[PDB]
Design a protein around this ligand. Structure first.
Ligand SMILES: *[C@@H]1O[C@H](CO)[C@@H](O)[C@H](O)[C@H]1NC(C)=O
Ligand SMILES: *[C@@H]1O[C@H](CO)[C@@H](O)[C@H](O)[C@H]1NC(C)=O
Ligand SMILES: *[C@@H]1O[C@H](CO)[C@@H](O)[C@H](O)[C@H]1NC(C)=O
Ligand SMILES: *[C@@H]1O[C@H](CO)[C@@H](O)[C@H](O)[C@H]1NC(C)=O
Ligand SMILES: *[C@@H]1O[C@H](CO)[C@@H](O)[C@H](O)[C@H]1NC(C)=O
Ligand SMILES: *[C@@H]1O[C@H](CO)[C@@H](O)[C@H](O)[C@H]1NC(C)=O
Lengths: 462, 462, 462
């Protein structure tokens, strides 16, 4: 853990380096089966309460099975706008659709006749891993049928009721979780796949030992980037499909960019111009190029490790890293946006905070022991979380992050002081440096042409 | 199931036809009641464990009732921006507010004195359907009071504890689900309304048989577009309001539009212009006009049937369908947006995928048996899911949808090759064809006027 | 409850006054502890079913503890774009990180040796409130060990199994809720903090009596603006951190602004200009200034009281209230946006509805007794919820809110009739009154200069 952070005063932005990558670059699909029963009907002219409880539990089981069948017979009769779209569950749904052909269920049942785990080939020629996580058929047919199938339902025992309830609870919960999500669920609960079974699926994937260890250590995130799909219920067997991620890129450098608006500080109201850098997010080296994640909601962090998803990313060249040290470079075209609004805000970075204090707003950073230790002036400034606990930007109070690290301050004149406020192209959402430069150079051309003609007409007088 | 898809090369967009509509055009409200008890106090100088368990369950019941009373005494002392706003629970909240007038609870209790279902008229003159889904009062008053009301609490039986737990669990879950949602819940769980009661409410609505059948078959979606509202707890009765949808438009044609950016392929960096069609979403014929759903999150699909919601829609004329066959028609004004960014992406359609490959990005589509089967050039292209499993657009891998259907390819020169790159109005977010045409015709007017004057001054020399 | 609403016809917007404020201006953190056990191993050569049930429950407990340890050893090896960013759980995470130093667990255990509540000082010098909400150690070590530690596991009793299940359920649920949320949860469930313990924490905060009463009455919202953070599991004790809000500003006036587009009604298609007010949200007086909440998802309402959050707000001067009575005031610069789209929509306010009816759309408001009672013309209009139940704007049907109040109608000519349609700066997303005025005054300057030169050249002929 050697996270470092730099502040660039010339553009009012910060970069945090020192992380490691774990990117998702594929999917893995398996099949999970449950062996049910087909209890026909229960009939007793009894009066004991234990028989009543047994009948109630059996009724709940039948209702769950019927609801599952009914559900099955319904499916088969700033730069966030630059991203393409895709379907997240295409592979699992394809496997589920393959499962509906005739003879597949017989193949699955024949494969797992003796053992609880096997590898079977489907019709099209794909091999998937199967499992049998529960078996209610044997217990029901060997315990409950002798009590209630033909006899007068004489005497169940008190322990049998509790045992049956404990057995049936998991199936009830699985039915409940499929029911409300219309078939496809979000992070796979403990009922769908036990923590002792997730660690067993991982030790069967065709991956390297390092990826196996990474998936085993951080198992609470593999569970948050997975899907579960209901497939079929027929011929006394239940089957659903689990879709697990694959991490093909591991241990490559990553960094994050924090940006804030940078304005001018003229006293006259409504006489200030601003610009802001719009490309803020996560960047990670990936096979000779940089991947950009702008949604700020697809990447998780565990203290040095970032678990991103490559379906909501952009592939940029390796020169995108050069916008930091220099902004007027003739090799990349950094992205900005312009406006004319002067409002104070603050951005809480990983190792400090950025404060923009424009207008008459009072901005202050305070320590918890002495009290007030800094009074910001008008501009973009940055303070580190070493002796600072909270920062206030007016009516708002923020708490800074207290991670240990090293922060550096880079001086330099702001770039907003180089432009001409009489020709600046305001209200230019999602512009770039070259576009802004082009829009300015041509207005002066019109002005000069006008001046030329005006001089010329006063030259031809005589 | 006869879904069809077309690709229009001239605008880099695709249309998928063949669906059917089921639109929500109203609400239906009912009342669900529960009959509670008013156990005052329990006192025993006992030592048996069964008495302890009974007391614990009674304490949980009292705590749930108290929490419900406390909650009740708190409420009564791209084109996604074009949509208006509305309140989703106005009708249910209105009914709940009507329920608070004096004498309403007496009317409800008198209506359901003997049967479990009745129709009653409130004060203002509206008739609603009531129900009684649970009755703990009779069981408690006829079983638990003889054990603990006055006596020394001699001997409960072991089965009674389990029976009471099973009875009380549902009320505990209902209290839990109201507690965390502040009164109004999202898709109605199995505890609020049993699957055997939802199918009974549907057979009492004033609707046609076809709508009844549609609601009965797809019951997992009627449950996802419904609300539950806590109303009152007083005079030993609990009542909450359920708000069910109504589907007034059924079996009308629908289709979806997929759009992707279309750019120019000049070699020089920063010398390309782009435009994109911004109106992508679901369209459905509705009584002589087309309804547009741009949020891309309000419509569900079950293999040919689309369950949309009409509160987040727009009403467009019937000529909006004409932007597909022609884009320069003098009857509608299709909506576009312009920029100057050249980044590669991909859009996964229903029966294929659209690939945009600009710059130095390597784009490829691969089959799972042979391997690589296509290498895209620079431009907008489209490939169908017949012999293609995955497509990669650089560092990203996508899985195409494997639905069966028929796809067609329509040729034609791209429209971006007709414009003049010296006067093209870039950075024009949310423009239209006529606006872009107007902004170009007037710059040439200024240029021609300038040329006219410049020639004229050199005509008056002598 | 004296809510009032006004409609300003000149700008097609409405204001609803009469509310009260309860703003969050800080955090409060406490520690919740659970006393576990360290059962080593269970071994019985038994055959009774009760022993089997006991062993199963013990196995579940061990699995929960192991999963918790594994999770712990993973974290330590329109104007919505104007808002700054911040970290919501900085304080709780800081306290959790402080908890990991050596000797802290010993201090916590020594503080709560005898009582269930104490105040203890950590290493850095901060005092926090601790608690002991559950004790499984004593029950396990005094009941289950005599049954299964060394003996042949002779006879458990039937009531012991149920008692142990009831004890263990809460720990199982806590483990389940941490497991799927990766450590940090959203609104604190009933398992993490009992409703009888939340009301006990509130009576220990260093706050005034009025804030205590406000927090006690509306306890279902204090629970929705809180976080729970997993911290540690070691040395036979479990500890997690709860982060509760603080309400520093209470009983200050608030109001809401509703805005809708305002267009021109020329008959020719594609010849209309529009403008819309973009600053819609909640405003609340706060210490000599107004706080603006634009996200429309951070503020809740209970019939006169608004529970907002100050982390997603903006601090504006006190002159922002002046845009309502007048829009051309020389003291503030109200924010608008321009376009050229004519589409009909509707905005449902608190005491009525705003209807915009442009083009050939049919807009109508209907009562539930007579039927149709109003037919809107082309323009922006407003109708109150007194004799009106629903309003339709085409293919869409809306339900108005039926709250009691007083509404007022303010006449005045629309401002869109003052501009010149030949120089109006369309497609100017997020503009302002002064910017639009500036962009118009300078085009006329160019036209006049052109005319001047053209006259001048025809003056020098001879
Ligand atoms: C991290 O920095 C520390 C300095 O305290 C030192 O151990 C070394 O430079 C780095 N350790 C690594 C990269 O393992
Ligand atoms: C000046 O005009 C040239 C075209 O001749 C253009 O390429 C350039 O971007 C403009 N601005 C500057 C600063 O050179
Ligand atoms: C759907 O297409 C098939 C062609 O395979 C044929 O049955 C018919 O054209 C269509 N059936 C319908 C619309 O029911
Ligand atoms: C040309 O100018 C006319 C106005 O005289 C305008 O209506 C039209 O949109 C412009 N462009 C074209 C292609 O006609
Ligand atoms: C609210 O209005 C009512 C009028 O019916 C009246 O009691 C008084 O003006 C107000 N009451 C308050 C503010 O307590
Ligand atoms: C007119 O031009 C002046 C600059 O001389 C500018 O300040 C003003 O905003 C423009 N418009 C009006 C209506 O005065």
């Amino acid at each position: 853990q050697n996270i470092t952070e730099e502040f660039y005063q010339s553009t009012c932005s910060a970069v945090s380096k020192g992380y490691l990558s774990a990117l998702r670059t594929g999917w893995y699909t398996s099949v999970i089966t449950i062996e049910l029963s087909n209890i026909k009907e229960n009939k007793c002219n009894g009066t004991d309460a234990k028989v009543k409880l047994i009948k109630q539990e059996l009724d709940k089981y039948k209702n769950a099975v019927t609801e599952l069948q009914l559900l099955m017979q319904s499916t088969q009769a700033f730069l966030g706008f630059l991203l393409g779209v895709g379907s997240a569950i295409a592979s699992g749904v394809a496997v589920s659709k393959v499962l509906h052909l005739e003879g597949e269920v017989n193949k699955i049942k024949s494969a797992l006749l003796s053992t609880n785990k096997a590898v079977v080939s489907l019709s099209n020629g794909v091999s998937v891993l199967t499992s049998k996580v529960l078996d209610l058929k044997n217990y029901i047919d060997k315990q409950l049928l002798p009590i209630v199938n033909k006899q007068s339902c004489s005497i169940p025992n008190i322990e049998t009721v509790i045992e049956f309830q404990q057995k049936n609870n998991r199936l009830l919960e699985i039915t409940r979780e499929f029911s409300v999500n219309a078939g496809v669920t979000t992070p796979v609960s403990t009922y769908m796949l036990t923590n002792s079974e997730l660690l067993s699926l991982i030790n069967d994937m065709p991956i390297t030992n390092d990826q196996k260890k990474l998936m085993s250590n951080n198992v609470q995130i593999v569970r948050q980037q997975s899907y579960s799909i209901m497939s079929i219920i027929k011929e006394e067997v239940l089957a659903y499909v689990v879709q697990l991620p694959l991490y093909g890129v591991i241990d490559t450098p990553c960094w994050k960019l924090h940006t804030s608006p940078l304005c001018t500080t003229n006293t006259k109201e409504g006489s200030n111009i601003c610009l802001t850098r719009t490309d803020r997010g996560w960047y990670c080296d990936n096979a000779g190029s940089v991947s950009f994640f702008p949604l700020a909601e697809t990447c998780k962090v565990q203290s040095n490790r970032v678990f991103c998803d490559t379906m909501n990313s952009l592939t940029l060249p390796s020169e995108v890293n050069l916008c930091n040290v220099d902004i007027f470079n003739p090799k990349y075209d950094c992205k900005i946006m312009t406006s004319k609004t002067d409002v104070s805000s603050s951005v809480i970075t990983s190792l400090g905070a950025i404060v923009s204090c424009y207008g008459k707003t009072k901005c202050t950073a305070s320590n918890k022991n002495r009290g007030i230790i800094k009074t910001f002036s008008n501009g973009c400034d940055y303070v580190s979380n070493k002796g600072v606990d909270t920062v206030s930007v007016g009516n708002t109070l923020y708490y800074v992050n207290k991670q240990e690290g090293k922060s550096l301050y880079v001086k330099g004149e702001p770039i907003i002081n180089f432009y001409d406020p009489l020709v600046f192209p305001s209200n230019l959402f999602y512009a770039s440096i070259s576009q802004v430069n082009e829009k300015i150079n041509q207005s002066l051309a019109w002005i000069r042409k006008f001046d030329e003609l005006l001089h010329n007409v006063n030259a031809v007088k005589s």
